[PDB]
Design a protein around this ligand. Structure first.
Ligand SMILES: Nc1nc2c(ncn2[C@@H]2O[C@H](COP(=O)(O)OP(=O)(O)OP(=O)(O)O)[C@@H](O)[C@H]2O)c(=O)[nH]1
Ligand SMILES: [Mg+2]
Length: 156
């Protein structure tokens, strides 16, 4: 009676992958954290979805959609997005994998990646860009829901 979506959250260490997932799962922001996956049931456009979420193998090759996360005060995390996308394109053998680019930590003032750099990168890949804060919860639902919608756009 519900539809499963297998989602994988990738990106450089420290960008807030666990925090974003924990925000989705328990509606709270964890300052310090620690080895498995999470399930969440959520209605998205009138469909009961069971999200199966891996934070950071089986999931990489069977994942249906990817959140590619960098932090907006970590220029290197942003630069490394290319490596994460090439990896995904390799291990799914397609140039057209459901994916959302997420720029996390928007609450922080120390901002070294501009919204234009990020908009440019996402436009080049043909994917949505969503800005988030795991701390304030801004954008978190939006990122996961938009990923579900990209998966649907691609396959039944
Ligand atoms: N201010 C702020 N801090 C955040 C945010 N997201 C995560 N952090 C902090 O950044 C640090 C790293 O967050 P994690 O979720 O552990 O990062 P991760 O990407 O899962 O790191 P790995 O699991 O090592 O790959 C932690 O101290 C978090 O509290 C955010 O949106 N805003
Ligand atoms: Mg993590």
């Amino acid at each position: 009676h519900m539809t499963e979506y297998k989602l994988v959250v990738v990106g450089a260490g420290g960008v807030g992958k666990s925090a974003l997932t924990i925000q989705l799962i328990q509606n709270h922001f964890v300052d310090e954290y620690d080895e498995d996956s999470y399930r969440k049931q959520v209605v998205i456009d009138g469909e009961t979805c069971l999200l199966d979420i891996l934070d950071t193998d089986q999931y990489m090759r069977t994942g249906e959609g990817f959140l590619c996360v960098f932090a907006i005060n970590n220029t290197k995390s942003f630069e490394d997005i290319h490596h994460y996308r090439e990896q995904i394109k390799r291990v799914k053998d397609s140039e057209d994998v459901p994916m959302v680019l997420v720029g996390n930590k928007s609450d922080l003032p120390s901002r070294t990646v501009d919204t234009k750099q990020a908009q440019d990168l996402a436009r080049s890949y043909g994917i949505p860009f969503i800005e988030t804060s795991a701390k304030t919860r801004q954008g978190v639902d939006d990122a996961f829901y938009t990923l579900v919608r990209e998966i649907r756009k691609h396959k039944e």
